Write a protein that binds this DNA or RNA. Structure first.
Lengths: 98, 133, 331, 96, 73
RNA sequence: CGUCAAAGCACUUUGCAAAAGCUAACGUAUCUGUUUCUUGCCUUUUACCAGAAACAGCCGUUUGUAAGGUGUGCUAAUUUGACUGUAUAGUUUUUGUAAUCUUUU
């Protein structure tokens, strides 16, 4: 399967681990064991913070996943114009009759 | 519409074997050496002519015999190989493919012995000349 | 504007670039020739004599040919000037059985510290006046390494020539022994010893390694022999039905040897030429009775004289080389 | 899988990691594994206490690793498509 | 699977193992496993006291192992 | 082979567009003409000899796209793409060494 997991790719995530710690950052790479790779990571042990960088977690260590934010980031047809004119028709009445 | 065709192996086999009397027997290309479409261009440009080949219209102080060293005349074959070297004022010339790998495939004449059978034309392979570590 | 380069194919691609990439200009290329070199065959009969322009110093040295085992070792880099004198003297004594005082007395190697020429001391008065000779170390080398870079015959390099400093007459001050008064006379001593010692030209040969089928062989031999060829080895090489034909050829007589192989053997038989060796020209380059004709080629010993006149003709030197009396001092 | 190849690519650089033990290790990485074994040198350990030490050579078991911390240039590295019948990611010229 | 680990360079050399329950052992590395089960000879405990008891030939389980060190370069 | 997405499908007729982007057979084929020059054989110009450069035609080839035709299916078949595609309860991840208590700030 893993169809849902590809959809998460390149989003800022909030990942709770078995220790209780919570890592945060974008998701670059993903596995069948749920090994996650995360970019520009920050733990929140708890009024606390730390800067790590690139972090590769195991599957054993991970508990839950949750998105913090969204993913980060016919030329010219034939037609031609002209000016005015607005000719008057001598005849009245509809197009087909006469 | 009859564009595009795909032929089985055994079919192409028969066609080959039926057409045999027409199609060639070279496989190498080295054979041509001085008989390539390039060589013949230079001949035309240098106004020289090679023996078996064609011959066209022409297209188009420092020498001193006492300064030269006469050792083996220098033939026309030599000018058509290295036109920039052996020949001066070389224009409108084409340079040719210098050598190809050389094919080492002899087709099986007697078709009973298998596909992979050490042929008697290959030299034994003995190595008593060598001195190793 | 004579320009050099490894061989036919190399020269083709220069004269392609300069003709169509760099300059966009027509040319009159000449028929290619080899770069010659020059050596001594035997010892000199008459010992040398030389005077400085000031006549305060007299230099004399003997020229002798080296053994062929030695010459190769220097160009490989088995022996240097930068090593200690004791390590260098151990080399010659144990391989070629030189004397003990002769082995230590090596000054410096030939043209630009590689070319197979050697300086040496052969005298006793040097032991008496040792510190007097040590003021004249570099004044000999700067007229020797510059003076043997170029040569007597064709203004070319020299091979296998030893030098043996015999007599050295000296003056009181070191102002009488100047750079301008020693160097251009110290160089003249080499050219004088050459003419007495009977010199000859040497030319390069390169190893032609042909490949071929068995049937083509006879044509290869018949082609080679006409251009002076010595087959070193002919074998059916293993694992593939081809005969190797290693060979040697004198560079002057390999002008287009490749294209004649490929023609005559109909697309079989490839050949390469890898610089090797240096082979001496059979005849003597200084012989007045030889001169033949400027149109037809030469054959035996008469060929050596032919190259010399022609080589000097191209340079713009005196053609006869009869001005040997200029460099031979006076007696 | 890509989470393993990134590891193999940080061989040579200096790595930080965390084990079930509780301690963190820092050093040059020499060899890794698909298991997540490791082989490091000049390691500078720091436990829960804060106690520093030195360990010349070390082997590990992946099972015991919680997570790694890897150099910054290892985010521009290529992440390939892999395939159904291949172990190592690598780039792929052929069919698919 | 079953990547036979790179323990060839530790064979017939002294070690300083660590295992589960903060217990550790010294020994000559005889043989290893797919699952990292180990064979140690001349096995000496390192008790929490520091009292070193000689045992002999011993087979440590793979699961347990935390790490494996070298005493001498 | 497996999944997902798109689409009728295979075969065919016309129309309309393109076809050196980094030195290379749109065509492993190959013919005529115009102009400008050079040489041939020549005096009637044409018709020609055989080289060059510059332009042109003609016989063909490929691709995309649009509308059609025949046969088959629109209660199906075929094509086309895309893909982080495999199954493991017994030691390195998904069938747990967990559970529980207490003290310190």
């Amino acid at each position: 399967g893993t169809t849902k997991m590809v959809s998460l790719l390149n989003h800022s995530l909030n990942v709770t681990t078995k220790d209780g710690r919570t890592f945060v950052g974008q998701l670059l790479a993903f596995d069948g064991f749920m090994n996650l790779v995360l970019s520009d990571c920050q733990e929140y042990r708890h009024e606390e913070k730390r800067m790590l960088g690139l972090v590769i977690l195991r599957g054993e260590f991970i508990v839950s996943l949750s998105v913090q934010g969204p993913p980060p980031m016919l030329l010219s047809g034939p037609g031609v114009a002209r000016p005015a004119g607005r000719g008057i028709p001598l005849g009245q009445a509809p197009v087909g009759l006469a | 519409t009859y564009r595009r065709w795909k032929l089985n192996l055994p079919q192409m086999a028969n066609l080959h074997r039926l057409g045999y009397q027409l199609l060639s027997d070279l496989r190498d290309d080295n054979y041509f050496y001085l008989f390539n479409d390039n060589s013949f261009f230079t001949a035309k440009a240098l106004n020289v002519a090679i023996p078996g080949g064609p011959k066209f219209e022409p297209l188009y102080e420092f020498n001193d015999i006492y300064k030269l060293i006469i050792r083996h005349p220098i033939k026309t074959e030599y000018r058509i190989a290295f036109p920039y070297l052996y020949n001066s004022r070389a224009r409108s010339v084409a340079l040719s493919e210098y050598h190809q790998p050389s094919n080492v495939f002899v087709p099986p004449e007697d078709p009973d012995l298998p596909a992979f059978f050490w042929d008697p034309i290959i030299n034994p392979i003995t190595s008593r000349q060598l001195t190793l570590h | 504007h004579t320009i050099f380069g490894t061989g036919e194919m190399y020269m083709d691609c220069l004269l392609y670039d300069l003709r169509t990439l760099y300059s966009e200009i027509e040319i009159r290329v000449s028929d290619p020739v080899a770069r010659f070199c020059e050596t001594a065959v035997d010892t000199s009969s008459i010992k040398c004599f030389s005077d400085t322009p000031n006549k305060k110093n007299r230099i004399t040295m003997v020229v002798e040919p080296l053994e062929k085992g030695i010459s190769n070792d220097i160009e490989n880099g088995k022996v240097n000037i930068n090593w200690p004198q004791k390590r260098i003297s151990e080399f010659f004594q144990k391989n070629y059985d030189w004397d003990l005082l002769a082995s230590r007395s090596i000054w410096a190697f030939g043209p630009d510290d590689r070319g197979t020429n050697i300086l040496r001391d052969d005298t006793l008065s040097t032991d008496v006046d040792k510190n007097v000779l040590n003021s004249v170390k570099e004044y000999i080398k700067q007229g020797f390494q510059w003076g043997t870079r170029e040569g007597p015959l064709c203004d070319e390099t020299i091979r296998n020539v030893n030098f043996r400093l015999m007599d050295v007459v000296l003056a009181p001050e070191q102002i009488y022994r100047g750079g301008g008064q020693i160097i251009p006379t110290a160089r003249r001593v080499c050219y004088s010893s050459f003419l007495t010692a009977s010199p000859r030209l040497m030319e390069p040969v390169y190893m032609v390694e042909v490949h071929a089928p068995a049937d083509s062989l006879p044509i290869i031999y018949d082609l080679l022999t006409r251009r002076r060829g010595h087959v070193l080895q002919d074998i059916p090489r293993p694992g593939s039905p081809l005969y190797l034909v290693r060979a040697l050829i004198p560079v002057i007589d390999s002008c287009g040897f490749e294209t004649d192989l490929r023609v005559h053997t109909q697309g079989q038989a490839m050949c390469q030429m890898v610089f090797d060796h240096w082979q001496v020209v059979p005849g003597d380059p200084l012989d007045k009775s030889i001169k033949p004709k400027p149109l037809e080629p030469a054959r035996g010993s008469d060929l050596a004289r032919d190259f010399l006149i022609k080589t000097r003709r191209r340079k713009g030197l005196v053609e006869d080389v009869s001005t040997t009396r200029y460099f031979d001092q006076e007696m | 899988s890509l989470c393993i190849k990134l590891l193999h690519e940080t061989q040579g650089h200096i790595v930080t990691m965390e084990l079930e033990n509780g301690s963190t290790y820092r050093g040059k990485l020499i060899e890794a594994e698909d298991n997540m074994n490791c082989q490091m040198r000049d390691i500078s350990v720091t436990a829960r206490d804060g106690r520093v030490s030195h360990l010349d050579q070390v082997y590990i078991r992946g099972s015991h690793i919680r997570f790694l911390i890897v150099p910054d240039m290892l985010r521009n590295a290529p992440m390939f498509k892999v395939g159904p019948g291949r172990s190592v990611p690598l780039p792929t010229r052929g069919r698919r | 699977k079953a990547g036979a680990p790179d323990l060839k360079k530790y064979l017939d050399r002294q070690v300083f193992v660590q295992l589960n329950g903060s217990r550790k052992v010294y020994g000559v590395l005889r043989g290893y496993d797919i699952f990292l089960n180990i064979v140690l000879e001349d096995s000496i405990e390192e008790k929490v006291d520091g009292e070193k008891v000689k045992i002999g030939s011993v087979a440590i389980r793979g699961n347990s192992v935390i790490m494996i060190e070298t005493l001498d370069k």
